PDB file of N, CA and C in Angstrom:
ATOM      1  N   UNK A   1      24.032 -16.642  -7.952  1.00  0.00           N
ATOM      2  CA  UNK A   1      22.857 -17.155  -7.265  1.00  0.00           C
ATOM      3  C   UNK A   1      22.727 -16.472  -5.915  1.00  0.00           C
ATOM      4  N   UNK A   2      21.511 -16.054  -5.581  1.00  0.00           N
ATOM      5  CA  UNK A   2      21.201 -15.590  -4.239  1.00  0.00           C
ATOM      6  C   UNK A   2      19.793 -16.033  -3.883  1.00  0.00           C
ATOM      7  N   UNK A   3      19.440 -15.859  -2.614  1.00  0.00           N
ATOM      8  CA  UNK A   3      18.168 -16.327  -2.079  1.00  0.00           C
ATOM      9  C   UNK A   3      17.580 -15.242  -1.189  1.00  0.00           C
ATOM     10  N   UNK A   4      16.553 -14.560  -1.684  1.00  0.00           N
ATOM     11  CA  UNK A   4      15.860 -13.566  -0.903  1.00  0.00           C
ATOM     12  C   UNK A   4      14.397 -13.901  -0.714  1.00  0.00           C
ATOM     13  N   UNK A   5      13.619 -12.957  -0.188  1.00  0.00           N
ATOM     14  CA  UNK A   5      12.169 -13.134  -0.143  1.00  0.00           C
ATOM     15  C   UNK A   5      11.540 -13.105  -1.523  1.00  0.00           C
ATOM     16  N   UNK A   6      10.321 -13.640  -1.585  1.00  0.00           N
ATOM     17  CA  UNK A   6       9.571 -13.732  -2.828  1.00  0.00           C
ATOM     18  C   UNK A   6       8.423 -12.742  -2.921  1.00  0.00           C
ATOM     19  N   UNK A   7       7.984 -12.171  -1.803  1.00  0.00           N
ATOM     20  CA  UNK A   7       6.835 -11.284  -1.799  1.00  0.00           C
ATOM     21  C   UNK A   7       7.149 -10.045  -0.978  1.00  0.00           C
ATOM     22  N   UNK A   8       6.290  -9.043  -1.112  1.00  0.00           N
ATOM     23  CA  UNK A   8       6.372  -7.862  -0.274  1.00  0.00           C
ATOM     24  C   UNK A   8       5.890  -8.192   1.130  1.00  0.00           C
ATOM     25  N   UNK A   9       6.423  -7.472   2.110  1.00  0.00           N
ATOM     26  CA  UNK A   9       5.816  -7.493   3.429  1.00  0.00           C
ATOM     27  C   UNK A   9       4.510  -6.718   3.387  1.00  0.00           C
ATOM     28  N   UNK A  10       3.501  -7.225   4.080  1.00  0.00           N
ATOM     29  CA  UNK A  10       2.172  -6.630   4.051  1.00  0.00           C
ATOM     30  C   UNK A  10       1.949  -5.848   5.335  1.00  0.00           C
ATOM     31  N   UNK A  11       1.724  -4.543   5.209  1.00  0.00           N
ATOM     32  CA  UNK A  11       1.260  -3.729   6.326  1.00  0.00           C
ATOM     33  C   UNK A  11      -0.121  -3.188   6.007  1.00  0.00           C
ATOM     34  N   UNK A  12      -1.055  -3.390   6.929  1.00  0.00           N
ATOM     35  CA  UNK A  12      -2.441  -2.987   6.759  1.00  0.00           C
ATOM     36  C   UNK A  12      -2.937  -2.428   8.087  1.00  0.00           C
ATOM     37  N   UNK A  13      -3.831  -1.444   8.011  1.00  0.00           N
ATOM     38  CA  UNK A  13      -4.376  -0.785   9.193  1.00  0.00           C
ATOM     39  C   UNK A  13      -5.562  -1.605   9.697  1.00  0.00           C
ATOM     40  N   UNK A  14      -5.308  -2.443  10.694  1.00  0.00           N
ATOM     41  CA  UNK A  14      -6.339  -3.294  11.263  1.00  0.00           C
ATOM     42  C   UNK A  14      -7.008  -2.579  12.434  1.00  0.00           C
ATOM     43  N   UNK A  15      -7.756  -3.342  13.237  1.00  0.00           N
ATOM     44  CA  UNK A  15      -8.827  -2.839  14.086  1.00  0.00           C
ATOM     45  C   UNK A  15      -8.439  -1.827  15.144  1.00  0.00           C
ATOM     46  N   UNK A  16      -7.170  -1.756  15.521  1.00  0.00           N
ATOM     47  CA  UNK A  16      -6.827  -0.796  16.562  1.00  0.00           C
ATOM     48  C   UNK A  16      -6.226   0.477  15.985  1.00  0.00           C
ATOM     49  N   UNK A  17      -5.410   0.363  14.935  1.00  0.00           N
ATOM     50  CA  UNK A  17      -4.938   1.543  14.220  1.00  0.00           C
ATOM     51  C   UNK A  17      -6.049   2.236  13.455  1.00  0.00           C
ATOM     52  N   UNK A  18      -7.050   1.482  13.003  1.00  0.00           N
ATOM     53  CA  UNK A  18      -8.108   2.030  12.171  1.00  0.00           C
ATOM     54  C   UNK A  18      -9.042   2.931  12.960  1.00  0.00           C
ATOM     55  N   UNK A  19      -9.094   2.783  14.282  1.00  0.00           N
ATOM     56  CA  UNK A  19      -9.895   3.698  15.083  1.00  0.00           C
ATOM     57  C   UNK A  19      -9.165   5.023  15.254  1.00  0.00           C
ATOM     58  N   UNK A  20      -7.854   4.972  15.482  1.00  0.00           N
ATOM     59  CA  UNK A  20      -7.069   6.190  15.601  1.00  0.00           C
ATOM     60  C   UNK A  20      -6.768   6.828  14.254  1.00  0.00           C
ATOM     61  N   UNK A  21      -6.850   6.073  13.158  1.00  0.00           N
ATOM     62  CA  UNK A  21      -6.680   6.677  11.842  1.00  0.00           C
ATOM     63  C   UNK A  21      -7.906   7.485  11.451  1.00  0.00           C
ATOM     64  N   UNK A  22      -9.093   6.950  11.719  1.00  0.00           N
ATOM     65  CA  UNK A  22     -10.331   7.669  11.451  1.00  0.00           C
ATOM     66  C   UNK A  22     -10.481   8.862  12.384  1.00  0.00           C
ATOM     67  N   UNK A  23     -10.368   8.633  13.688  1.00  0.00           N
ATOM     68  CA  UNK A  23     -10.817   9.632  14.648  1.00  0.00           C
ATOM     69  C   UNK A  23      -9.736  10.658  14.963  1.00  0.00           C
ATOM     70  N   UNK A  24      -8.496  10.212  15.149  1.00  0.00           N
ATOM     71  CA  UNK A  24      -7.430  11.155  15.451  1.00  0.00           C
ATOM     72  C   UNK A  24      -6.708  11.661  14.216  1.00  0.00           C
ATOM     73  N   UNK A  25      -6.794  10.947  13.103  1.00  0.00           N
ATOM     74  CA  UNK A  25      -6.023  11.305  11.940  1.00  0.00           C
ATOM     75  C   UNK A  25      -4.551  11.010  12.062  1.00  0.00           C
ATOM     76  N   UNK A  26      -4.167  10.063  12.914  1.00  0.00           N
ATOM     77  CA  UNK A  26      -2.798   9.586  13.032  1.00  0.00           C
ATOM     78  C   UNK A  26      -2.829   8.082  13.267  1.00  0.00           C
ATOM     79  N   UNK A  27      -2.006   7.343  12.528  1.00  0.00           N
ATOM     80  CA  UNK A  27      -1.898   5.902  12.717  1.00  0.00           C
ATOM     81  C   UNK A  27      -0.458   5.540  13.033  1.00  0.00           C
ATOM     82  N   UNK A  28      -0.199   4.243  13.163  1.00  0.00           N
ATOM     83  CA  UNK A  28       1.094   3.782  13.646  1.00  0.00           C
ATOM     84  C   UNK A  28       1.415   2.422  13.057  1.00  0.00           C
ATOM     85  N   UNK A  29       2.694   2.193  12.782  1.00  0.00           N
ATOM     86  CA  UNK A  29       3.160   0.888  12.338  1.00  0.00           C
ATOM     87  C   UNK A  29       3.189  -0.068  13.523  1.00  0.00           C
ATOM     88  N   UNK A  30       2.448  -1.179  13.414  1.00  0.00           N
ATOM     89  CA  UNK A  30       2.456  -2.307  14.357  1.00  0.00           C
ATOM     90  C   UNK A  30       2.063  -1.860  15.771  1.00  0.00           C
ATOM     91  N   UNK A  31       0.767  -1.548  15.902  1.00  0.00           N
ATOM     92  CA  UNK A  31       0.168  -1.182  17.186  1.00  0.00           C
ATOM     93  C   UNK A  31       0.394  -2.247  18.257  1.00  0.00           C
ATOM     94  N   UNK A  32       0.414  -3.527  17.875  1.00  0.00           N
ATOM     95  CA  UNK A  32       0.466  -4.617  18.845  1.00  0.00           C
ATOM     96  C   UNK A  32       1.779  -4.646  19.613  1.00  0.00           C
ATOM     97  N   UNK A  33       2.864  -4.149  19.032  1.00  0.00           N
ATOM     98  CA  UNK A  33       4.133  -4.073  19.740  1.00  0.00           C
ATOM     99  C   UNK A  33       4.201  -2.864  20.667  1.00  0.00           C
ATOM    100  N   UNK A  34       3.594  -1.743  20.273  1.00  0.00           N
ATOM    101  CA  UNK A  34       3.528  -0.575  21.146  1.00  0.00           C
ATOM    102  C   UNK A  34       2.651  -0.834  22.362  1.00  0.00           C
ATOM    103  N   UNK A  35       1.548  -1.561  22.184  1.00  0.00           N
ATOM    104  CA  UNK A  35       0.688  -1.855  23.323  1.00  0.00           C
ATOM    105  C   UNK A  35       1.301  -2.921  24.218  1.00  0.00           C
ATOM    106  N   UNK A  36       2.036  -3.875  23.656  1.00  0.00           N
ATOM    107  CA  UNK A  36       2.642  -4.914  24.483  1.00  0.00           C
ATOM    108  C   UNK A  36       3.949  -4.486  25.135  1.00  0.00           C
ATOM    109  N   UNK A  37       4.266  -3.196  25.158  1.00  0.00           N
ATOM    110  CA  UNK A  37       5.462  -2.708  25.828  1.00  0.00           C
ATOM    111  C   UNK A  37       5.156  -1.557  26.778  1.00  0.00           C
ATOM    112  N   UNK A  38       4.134  -0.756  26.476  1.00  0.00           N
ATOM    113  CA  UNK A  38       3.810   0.369  27.348  1.00  0.00           C
ATOM    114  C   UNK A  38       3.024  -0.102  28.569  1.00  0.00           C
ATOM    115  N   UNK A  39       2.065  -1.004  28.379  1.00  0.00           N
ATOM    116  CA  UNK A  39       1.193  -1.437  29.471  1.00  0.00           C
ATOM    117  C   UNK A  39       1.530  -2.851  29.950  1.00  0.00           C
ATOM    118  N   UNK A  40       2.105  -3.696  29.086  1.00  0.00           N
ATOM    119  CA  UNK A  40       2.347  -5.083  29.484  1.00  0.00           C
ATOM    120  C   UNK A  40       3.691  -5.248  30.180  1.00  0.00           C
ATOM    121  N   UNK A  41       4.725  -4.566  29.698  1.00  0.00           N
ATOM    122  CA  UNK A  41       6.047  -4.593  30.327  1.00  0.00           C
ATOM    123  C   UNK A  41       6.610  -3.180  30.390  1.00  0.00           C
ATOM    124  N   UNK A  42       6.116  -2.351  31.318  1.00  0.00           N
ATOM    125  CA  UNK A  42       6.511  -0.930  31.323  1.00  0.00           C
ATOM    126  C   UNK A  42       7.939  -0.684  31.772  1.00  0.00           C
ATOM    127  N   UNK A  43       8.580  -1.650  32.428  1.00  0.00           N
ATOM    128  CA  UNK A  43       9.928  -1.487  32.958  1.00  0.00           C
ATOM    129  C   UNK A  43      10.960  -2.305  32.190  1.00  0.00           C
ATOM    130  N   UNK A  44      10.612  -2.773  30.997  1.00  0.00           N
ATOM    131  CA  UNK A  44      11.535  -3.556  30.189  1.00  0.00           C
ATOM    132  C   UNK A  44      12.503  -2.620  29.480  1.00  0.00           C
ATOM    133  N   UNK A  45      13.783  -2.715  29.831  1.00  0.00           N
ATOM    134  CA  UNK A  45      14.800  -1.892  29.199  1.00  0.00           C
ATOM    135  C   UNK A  45      15.007  -2.339  27.751  1.00  0.00           C
ATOM    136  N   UNK A  46      15.388  -1.422  26.858  1.00  0.00           N
ATOM    137  CA  UNK A  46      15.606  -1.813  25.457  1.00  0.00           C
ATOM    138  C   UNK A  46      16.868  -2.649  25.303  1.00  0.00           C
ATOM    139  N   UNK A  47      16.677  -3.951  25.126  1.00  0.00           N
ATOM    140  CA  UNK A  47      17.745  -4.891  24.830  1.00  0.00           C
ATOM    141  C   UNK A  47      17.740  -5.188  23.340  1.00  0.00           C
ATOM    142  N   UNK A  48      18.816  -5.804  22.857  1.00  0.00           N
ATOM    143  CA  UNK A  48      18.964  -5.968  21.416  1.00  0.00           C
ATOM    144  C   UNK A  48      18.221  -7.202  20.922  1.00  0.00           C
ATOM    145  N   UNK A  49      18.450  -8.353  21.554  1.00  0.00           N
ATOM    146  CA  UNK A  49      17.915  -9.602  21.018  1.00  0.00           C
ATOM    147  C   UNK A  49      16.440  -9.795  21.331  1.00  0.00           C
TER     148      UNK A  49
ATOM    149  N   UNK B   1     -38.860  12.002  48.785  1.00  0.00           N
ATOM    150  CA  UNK B   1     -37.777  11.018  48.738  1.00  0.00           C
ATOM    151  C   UNK B   1     -37.547  10.623  47.287  1.00  0.00           C
ATOM    152  N   UNK B   2     -36.302  10.710  46.824  1.00  0.00           N
ATOM    153  CA  UNK B   2     -35.950  10.347  45.458  1.00  0.00           C
ATOM    154  C   UNK B   2     -34.840   9.305  45.435  1.00  0.00           C
ATOM    155  N   UNK B   3     -34.707   8.646  44.287  1.00  0.00           N
ATOM    156  CA  UNK B   3     -33.666   7.655  44.065  1.00  0.00           C
ATOM    157  C   UNK B   3     -32.586   8.197  43.133  1.00  0.00           C
ATOM    158  N   UNK B   4     -31.335   7.950  43.507  1.00  0.00           N
ATOM    159  CA  UNK B   4     -30.203   8.417  42.746  1.00  0.00           C
ATOM    160  C   UNK B   4     -28.957   7.615  43.055  1.00  0.00           C
ATOM    161  N   UNK B   5     -27.875   7.863  42.313  1.00  0.00           N
ATOM    162  CA  UNK B   5     -26.652   7.076  42.491  1.00  0.00           C
ATOM    163  C   UNK B   5     -25.964   7.322  43.820  1.00  0.00           C
ATOM    164  N   UNK B   6     -25.248   6.297  44.278  1.00  0.00           N
ATOM    165  CA  UNK B   6     -24.543   6.381  45.548  1.00  0.00           C
ATOM    166  C   UNK B   6     -23.134   6.922  45.361  1.00  0.00           C
ATOM    167  N   UNK B   7     -22.550   6.719  44.184  1.00  0.00           N
ATOM    168  CA  UNK B   7     -21.178   7.129  43.934  1.00  0.00           C
ATOM    169  C   UNK B   7     -21.087   7.787  42.566  1.00  0.00           C
ATOM    170  N   UNK B   8     -19.914   8.339  42.281  1.00  0.00           N
ATOM    171  CA  UNK B   8     -19.650   8.946  40.992  1.00  0.00           C
ATOM    172  C   UNK B   8     -19.415   7.867  39.946  1.00  0.00           C
ATOM    173  N   UNK B   9     -19.428   8.276  38.686  1.00  0.00           N
ATOM    174  CA  UNK B   9     -19.053   7.383  37.604  1.00  0.00           C
ATOM    175  C   UNK B   9     -17.544   7.398  37.439  1.00  0.00           C
ATOM    176  N   UNK B  10     -16.974   6.225  37.212  1.00  0.00           N
ATOM    177  CA  UNK B  10     -15.536   6.099  37.070  1.00  0.00           C
ATOM    178  C   UNK B  10     -15.129   6.247  35.614  1.00  0.00           C
ATOM    179  N   UNK B  11     -13.948   6.825  35.407  1.00  0.00           N
ATOM    180  CA  UNK B  11     -13.305   6.846  34.098  1.00  0.00           C
ATOM    181  C   UNK B  11     -11.806   6.692  34.289  1.00  0.00           C
ATOM    182  N   UNK B  12     -11.260   5.574  33.814  1.00  0.00           N
ATOM    183  CA  UNK B  12      -9.853   5.222  33.981  1.00  0.00           C
ATOM    184  C   UNK B  12      -9.240   5.113  32.590  1.00  0.00           C
ATOM    185  N   UNK B  13      -7.977   5.526  32.446  1.00  0.00           N
ATOM    186  CA  UNK B  13      -7.319   5.612  31.144  1.00  0.00           C
ATOM    187  C   UNK B  13      -6.567   4.299  30.901  1.00  0.00           C
ATOM    188  N   UNK B  14      -6.941   3.243  31.621  1.00  0.00           N
ATOM    189  CA  UNK B  14      -6.297   1.947  31.440  1.00  0.00           C
ATOM    190  C   UNK B  14      -6.621   1.366  30.069  1.00  0.00           C
ATOM    191  N   UNK B  15      -5.738   0.496  29.594  1.00  0.00           N
ATOM    192  CA  UNK B  15      -5.985  -0.240  28.372  1.00  0.00           C
ATOM    193  C   UNK B  15      -5.414   0.429  27.139  1.00  0.00           C
ATOM    194  N   UNK B  16      -6.213   0.386  26.068  1.00  0.00           N
ATOM    195  CA  UNK B  16      -5.783   0.922  24.783  1.00  0.00           C
ATOM    196  C   UNK B  16      -5.875   2.439  24.733  1.00  0.00           C
ATOM    197  N   UNK B  17      -6.546   3.052  25.710  1.00  0.00           N
ATOM    198  CA  UNK B  17      -6.511   4.503  25.849  1.00  0.00           C
ATOM    199  C   UNK B  17      -5.120   4.985  26.220  1.00  0.00           C
ATOM    200  N   UNK B  18      -4.363   4.153  26.933  1.00  0.00           N
ATOM    201  CA  UNK B  18      -3.095   4.602  27.489  1.00  0.00           C
ATOM    202  C   UNK B  18      -2.013   4.647  26.421  1.00  0.00           C
ATOM    203  N   UNK B  19      -2.148   3.831  25.376  1.00  0.00           N
ATOM    204  CA  UNK B  19      -1.150   3.817  24.311  1.00  0.00           C
ATOM    205  C   UNK B  19      -1.229   5.100  23.500  1.00  0.00           C
ATOM    206  N   UNK B  20      -2.443   5.494  23.112  1.00  0.00           N
ATOM    207  CA  UNK B  20      -2.603   6.714  22.333  1.00  0.00           C
ATOM    208  C   UNK B  20      -2.445   7.954  23.197  1.00  0.00           C
ATOM    209  N   UNK B  21      -2.639   7.832  24.512  1.00  0.00           N
ATOM    210  CA  UNK B  21      -2.386   8.966  25.396  1.00  0.00           C
ATOM    211  C   UNK B  21      -0.896   9.242  25.514  1.00  0.00           C
ATOM    212  N   UNK B  22      -0.081   8.188  25.502  1.00  0.00           N
ATOM    213  CA  UNK B  22       1.362   8.365  25.624  1.00  0.00           C
ATOM    214  C   UNK B  22       1.992   8.665  24.270  1.00  0.00           C
ATOM    215  N   UNK B  23       1.714   7.840  23.260  1.00  0.00           N
ATOM    216  CA  UNK B  23       2.334   8.009  21.949  1.00  0.00           C
ATOM    217  C   UNK B  23       1.827   9.257  21.239  1.00  0.00           C
ATOM    218  N   UNK B  24       0.511   9.434  21.180  1.00  0.00           N
ATOM    219  CA  UNK B  24      -0.064  10.650  20.627  1.00  0.00           C
ATOM    220  C   UNK B  24      -0.460  11.596  21.751  1.00  0.00           C
ATOM    221  N   UNK B  25      -0.941  12.773  21.385  1.00  0.00           N
ATOM    222  CA  UNK B  25      -1.296  13.722  22.417  1.00  0.00           C
ATOM    223  C   UNK B  25      -2.755  13.704  22.816  1.00  0.00           C
ATOM    224  N   UNK B  26      -3.482  12.637  22.500  1.00  0.00           N
ATOM    225  CA  UNK B  26      -4.919  12.618  22.727  1.00  0.00           C
ATOM    226  C   UNK B  26      -5.355  11.303  23.351  1.00  0.00           C
ATOM    227  N   UNK B  27      -6.606  11.276  23.801  1.00  0.00           N
ATOM    228  CA  UNK B  27      -7.176  10.100  24.439  1.00  0.00           C
ATOM    229  C   UNK B  27      -8.690  10.157  24.332  1.00  0.00           C
ATOM    230  N   UNK B  28      -9.300   9.018  24.011  1.00  0.00           N
ATOM    231  CA  UNK B  28     -10.746   8.910  23.891  1.00  0.00           C
ATOM    232  C   UNK B  28     -11.431   8.990  25.248  1.00  0.00           C
ATOM    233  N   UNK B  29     -12.755   8.933  25.205  1.00  0.00           N
ATOM    234  CA  UNK B  29     -13.563   8.437  26.309  1.00  0.00           C
ATOM    235  C   UNK B  29     -14.271   7.189  25.807  1.00  0.00           C
ATOM    236  N   UNK B  30     -14.096   6.075  26.529  1.00  0.00           N
ATOM    237  CA  UNK B  30     -14.622   4.756  26.151  1.00  0.00           C
ATOM    238  C   UNK B  30     -14.183   4.352  24.747  1.00  0.00           C
ATOM    239  N   UNK B  31     -12.878   4.115  24.600  1.00  0.00           N
ATOM    240  CA  UNK B  31     -12.281   3.647  23.352  1.00  0.00           C
ATOM    241  C   UNK B  31     -12.898   2.343  22.859  1.00  0.00           C
ATOM    242  N   UNK B  32     -13.248   1.452  23.783  1.00  0.00           N
ATOM    243  CA  UNK B  32     -13.698   0.108  23.445  1.00  0.00           C
ATOM    244  C   UNK B  32     -15.068   0.107  22.777  1.00  0.00           C
ATOM    245  N   UNK B  33     -16.021   0.861  23.323  1.00  0.00           N
ATOM    246  CA  UNK B  33     -17.346   0.943  22.713  1.00  0.00           C
ATOM    247  C   UNK B  33     -17.295   1.771  21.436  1.00  0.00           C
ATOM    248  N   UNK B  34     -16.378   2.730  21.398  1.00  0.00           N
ATOM    249  CA  UNK B  34     -16.092   3.516  20.209  1.00  0.00           C
ATOM    250  C   UNK B  34     -15.464   2.672  19.108  1.00  0.00           C
ATOM    251  N   UNK B  35     -14.717   1.627  19.479  1.00  0.00           N
ATOM    252  CA  UNK B  35     -14.104   0.723  18.512  1.00  0.00           C
ATOM    253  C   UNK B  35     -15.131  -0.214  17.891  1.00  0.00           C
ATOM    254  N   UNK B  36     -16.111  -0.661  18.678  1.00  0.00           N
ATOM    255  CA  UNK B  36     -17.096  -1.627  18.209  1.00  0.00           C
ATOM    256  C   UNK B  36     -18.071  -1.053  17.192  1.00  0.00           C
ATOM    257  N   UNK B  37     -18.059   0.259  16.964  1.00  0.00           N
ATOM    258  CA  UNK B  37     -18.910   0.848  15.939  1.00  0.00           C
ATOM    259  C   UNK B  37     -18.167   0.963  14.614  1.00  0.00           C
ATOM    260  N   UNK B  38     -16.894   1.351  14.663  1.00  0.00           N
ATOM    261  CA  UNK B  38     -16.126   1.616  13.450  1.00  0.00           C
ATOM    262  C   UNK B  38     -15.696   0.323  12.769  1.00  0.00           C
ATOM    263  N   UNK B  39     -14.951  -0.526  13.482  1.00  0.00           N
ATOM    264  CA  UNK B  39     -14.304  -1.644  12.802  1.00  0.00           C
ATOM    265  C   UNK B  39     -15.043  -2.958  13.043  1.00  0.00           C
ATOM    266  N   UNK B  40     -15.727  -3.105  14.176  1.00  0.00           N
ATOM    267  CA  UNK B  40     -16.331  -4.397  14.475  1.00  0.00           C
ATOM    268  C   UNK B  40     -17.644  -4.588  13.731  1.00  0.00           C
ATOM    269  N   UNK B  41     -18.370  -3.502  13.488  1.00  0.00           N
ATOM    270  CA  UNK B  41     -19.678  -3.559  12.838  1.00  0.00           C
ATOM    271  C   UNK B  41     -19.933  -2.240  12.122  1.00  0.00           C
ATOM    272  N   UNK B  42     -19.397  -2.079  10.911  1.00  0.00           N
ATOM    273  CA  UNK B  42     -19.551  -0.810  10.192  1.00  0.00           C
ATOM    274  C   UNK B  42     -20.942  -0.667   9.594  1.00  0.00           C
ATOM    275  N   UNK B  43     -21.090   0.433   8.840  1.00  0.00           N
ATOM    276  CA  UNK B  43     -22.261   0.899   8.062  1.00  0.00           C
ATOM    277  C   UNK B  43     -23.612   0.563   8.702  1.00  0.00           C
ATOM    278  N   UNK B  44     -23.688   0.814  10.003  1.00  0.00           N
ATOM    279  CA  UNK B  44     -24.908   0.651  10.775  1.00  0.00           C
ATOM    280  C   UNK B  44     -25.366   2.034  11.199  1.00  0.00           C
ATOM    281  N   UNK B  45     -26.537   2.442  10.707  1.00  0.00           N
ATOM    282  CA  UNK B  45     -27.030   3.789  10.931  1.00  0.00           C
ATOM    283  C   UNK B  45     -27.359   3.996  12.408  1.00  0.00           C
ATOM    284  N   UNK B  46     -27.144   5.205  12.928  1.00  0.00           N
ATOM    285  CA  UNK B  46     -27.449   5.456  14.339  1.00  0.00           C
ATOM    286  C   UNK B  46     -28.947   5.451  14.596  1.00  0.00           C
ATOM    287  N   UNK B  47     -29.342   4.727  15.638  1.00  0.00           N
ATOM    288  CA  UNK B  47     -30.740   4.570  16.012  1.00  0.00           C
ATOM    289  C   UNK B  47     -30.830   4.614  17.526  1.00  0.00           C
ATOM    290  N   UNK B  48     -31.758   5.428  18.037  1.00  0.00           N
ATOM    291  CA  UNK B  48     -31.841   5.797  19.448  1.00  0.00           C
ATOM    292  C   UNK B  48     -32.058   4.598  20.366  1.00  0.00           C
ATOM    293  N   UNK B  49     -32.734   3.557  19.876  1.00  0.00           N
ATOM    294  CA  UNK B  49     -33.159   2.451  20.728  1.00  0.00           C
ATOM    295  C   UNK B  49     -31.978   1.606  21.195  1.00  0.00           C
TER     296      UNK B  49
END
């Protein structure tokens, strides 16, 4: 017996990646984390937890 | 005597322009108004008015 997930994780190109996917021809996994670290906390050192 | 602007037009790379400027090698002009055509309201034909 084991207990894992039941479904796939869903990744989809939503409203901010979809502009750079169309216009630049490059997209990114999870835009919201890249934006919330470059401009929101620019001096946050990479910690583990 | 003519009427004209008192100052220059501003363009700042703040916001979502700064993420793609750092992560990728490119940057829009007016990313926000450019976003409202592609994902916020698609298949709308260009009209001058």
